[PDB]
């Protein structure tokens, strides 16, 4: 049931909610204005016509103009500190926007961690995001800082904001493992 994906305010990318199912994707993608459908190691035709041991759909809100940072191989701020795609299994990254006939909750704006590093007397260690995990700055995002203490020092989180459009633009990272249609 993909109702929580379509019902409720979409979270920010750093606070993405993962929905694991252990289906009719034609209907699910019919009511989103799919702008980009980048499928890795799997055809865009076979994702809805194959049985899977386990299916995961990570969904979060992220602007379309900033989607170049979530592309594979991107590095630096906003590219490795919010979410990292897991390429161990075949993936399908979908950048879409819900259609007008469907109602979606609209958050205040788009928020993401531009850079979550650990500064101190011995330097700044970047706390990059592991594939499928969070940024360690999730609870202090987008902008904040705490005192870990010791060699690490201060956990500094630097965020960014963007004025969101008339409708939310949401990213879906679909991952399957080797759930029948």
């Amino acid at each position: 049931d993909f109702s929580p994906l379509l019902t409720g305010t979409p979270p920010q990318v750093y606070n993405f909610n993962r929905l694991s199912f252990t289906y009719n994707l034609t209907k699910l993608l019919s009511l989103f204005e799919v702008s980009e459908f980048s499928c890795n190691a799997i055809s865009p035709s076979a994702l809805a016509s194959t049985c899977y041991s386990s299916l995961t759909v990570d969904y979060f809100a992220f602007p379309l103009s900033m989607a170049s940072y979530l592309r594979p191989g991107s590095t630096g701020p906003t590219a490795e500190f919010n979410y990292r795609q897991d390429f161990s299994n075949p993936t399908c990254r979908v950048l879409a926007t819900p259609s007008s006939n469907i109602t979606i909750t609209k958050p205040s704006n788009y928020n993401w961690i531009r850079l979550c590093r650990t500064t101190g007397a011995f330097g700044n260690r970047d706390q990059k995001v592991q594939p499928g995990h969070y940024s360690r700055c999730r609870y202090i995002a987008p902008t904040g800082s705490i005192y870990l203490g010791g060699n690490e020092g201060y956990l500094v989180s630097d965020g960014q904001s963007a004025s969101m459009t008339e409708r939310v633009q949401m990213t879906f990272v679909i991952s399957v493992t080797f759930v029948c249609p």
Binding site: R117, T119, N124, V156
Partner: protein
């Protein structure tokens, strides 16, 4: 409760509060430079004032922790830079007087203005008025006028201001536990507390003198060749065995001999390599040029550019929608932000400038993991030397033949090699005696070895002796010719441009040897050579965390600045120059 722990937590707090403020100041300055308005400049000044106030407040707070008790090298090195009081040592009246003197000197240089009585409304300033005369004109009288007017209308009025500036700077330096201001400037190369890697402040003078003594034969041969070539352009103005007039050196001060290439080209029939037409015909925009530079750096082994570099950095002139100061600069804004600001045009000079500025950013991405105070080059000459070696390989015809910018059937012969080497030596070898001379003069004017009544006599004696340059018209002691230069009148050390030139060929020889390059060193590119990129990165990633001697040894295997790599680079030209000077006099008569 230990002093070490107190210093460590103080530096923790300082680094936490300095990354945000420095990033805010950098963002404000970048917004000003990218788009000049009245609000953006005011935001820039507010951010700079806040950053300076924070820096002063943390510097006064830093003196509580003594250096002798701190054991960690990182903490000690951060505290060293934090407790440098500087102008704060001087009293409020003295500090205000020094700042005012610097401000008037800088404004006098910036608004330098020249006009003959024949047209008081047709006045010419330095940029680009007199620069064009000094760089392009071929008239002895016109260049002499543009030289004397600039050194008698601007330099003549900086003399008492420069004397007071020297007095105040010596006061500040000696009150800061230095011998004089020259010792304070040389303190950048000082290393203490590291066994086998120590460097003294006074050792820099001896090393620079020794390296210049080793440079001198090549410079003398190049000077003789340039004098012989200029004798054909000014038949009745240059003596065969004498010095070179100061106004016939291709620019105002003779800092670079680049604009003398047209007169001193060895083989004018054979044209130099220029791939501008190739990129015009292949439709190479700014994005393609910078992606080619990124491909070069990745092939070397260094990381590719960040995504934010490709969206937050503007590489083309925005037009009239927003005025922009697009002098090509690299920007380490802090907090992982790197941006190149330049008006890229389809030209080989802008193609090599892309590699040059790309190499400045790579150093920043390398040491971005260092503490804020240690995020710099090992010394003041490391950063620009690292930048300058990336354009050495980029301009190599092998690199141009690998990216398709040069015809694969292009005939690289000895004539083109000599032309390229002469062009390189005009800008590189010709600026070393000038830099050494200027820094020596400043060093022992600050030291008090030259009385204020002997400033202009000693300066021109240095010009005739070290550089072989004779003044067109004698100058008594109201002029300030050194102050006619930007760095002298704007309080900038000049030796960074000497050591860099010796570091740049030290790295290139070390990297090429790591690249298993066979043949002349000037025909070397470090492309597709990970063994050279690793050696470069092992020094780049350190920052100021390790002594510049150790950082040098990490690449070149030697602890000290050396000149043999520089002389090896110009070896094909040195033999050709020696053959060309068999029937001429090498050296100048004073």
């Amino acid at each position: 409760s230990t002093i070490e722990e107190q210093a460590k937590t103080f530096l923790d707090k300082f680094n936490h509060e300095a990354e945000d403020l420095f990033y805010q100041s950098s963002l404000a300055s970048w917004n000003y430079n990218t788009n000049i308005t009245e609000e953006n400049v005011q935001n820039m000044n507010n951010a700079g004032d806040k950053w300076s106030a924070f820096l002063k407040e943390q510097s006064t707070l830093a003196q509580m922790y003594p250096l002798q008790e701190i054991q960690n090298l990182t903490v000690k090195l951060q505290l060293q830079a934090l407790q440098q009081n500087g102008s704060s040592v001087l009293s409020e009246d003295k500090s205000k007087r020094l700042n005012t003197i610097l401000n008037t000197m800088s404004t006098i240089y910036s608004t330098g203005k020249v006009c003959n009585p024949d047209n008081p409304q047709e006045c010419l300033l330095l940029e680009p008025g007199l620069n064009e005369i000094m760089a392009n004109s071929l008239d002895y009288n016109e260049r002499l006028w543009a030289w004397e007017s600039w050194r008698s209308e601007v330099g003549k009025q900086l003399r008492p201001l420069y004397e007071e500036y020297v007095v105040l700077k010596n006061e500040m330096a000696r009150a800061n536990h230095y011998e004089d201001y020259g010792d304070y400037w040389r303190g950048d190369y000082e290393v203490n507390g590291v066994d086998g890697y120590d460097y003294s402040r006074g050792q820099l003078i001896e090393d620079v003198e020794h390296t210049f003594e080793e440079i001198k034969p090549l410079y003398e041969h190049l000077h003789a060749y340039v004098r012989a070539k200029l004798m054909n352009a000014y038949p009745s103005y240059i003596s065969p065995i004498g010095c070179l007039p100061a106004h016939l050196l291709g620019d105002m001060w003779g800092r670079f001999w680049t604009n003398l290439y047209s007169l001193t080209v060895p083989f004018g029939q054979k044209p130099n390599i220029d791939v501008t037409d190739a990129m015009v015909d292949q439709a190479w925009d700014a994005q393609r040029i910078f992606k080619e530079a990124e491909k070069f750096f990745v092939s070397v082994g260094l990381p590719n550019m960040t995504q934010g570099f490709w969206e937050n950095s503007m590489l083309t002139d925005p037009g009239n929608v927003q005025k922009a100061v697009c002098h090509p600069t690299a920007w380490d804004l802090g907090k992982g932000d790197f941006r190149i600001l330049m008006c890229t045009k389809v030209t080989m000079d802008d193609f090599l400038t892309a590699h040059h500025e790309m190499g400045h950013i790579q150093y920043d991405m390398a040491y971005a993991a260092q503490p804020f105070l240690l995020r710099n080059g090992a010394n003041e000459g490391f950063h620009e030397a690292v930048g300058e070696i990336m354009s050495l390989s980029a301009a190599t015809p092998k690199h141009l033949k690998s990216i398709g910018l040069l015809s694969p059937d292009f005939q690289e012969d000895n004539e083109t090699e000599i032309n390229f080497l002469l062009k390189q030596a005009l800008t590189i070898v010709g600026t070393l005696p000038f830099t050494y001379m200027l820094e020596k003069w400043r060093w022992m004017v600050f030291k008090g070895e030259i009385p204020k009544d002997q400033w202009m006599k000693k300066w021109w004696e240095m010009k005739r002796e070290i550089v072989g340059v004779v003044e067109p018209v004698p100058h008594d002691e109201t002029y300030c010719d050194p102050a006619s230069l930007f760095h002298v009148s704007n309080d900038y050390s000049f030796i960074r441009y000497y050591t860099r030139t010796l570091y740049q060929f030290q790295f290139q020889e070390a990297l090429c040897q790591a690249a298993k390059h066979e043949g002349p060193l000037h025909k070397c590119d470090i492309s597709n050579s990970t063994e050279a990129g690793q050696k470069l990165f092992n020094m780049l990633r350190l920052g100021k965390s390790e002594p510049w001697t150790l950082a040098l040894e990490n690449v070149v295997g030697a602890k000290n600045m050396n000149v043999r790599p520089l002389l090896n680079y110009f070896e094909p030209l040195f033999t050709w120059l020696k053959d060309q000077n068999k029937n001429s006099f090498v050296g100048w008569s004073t």
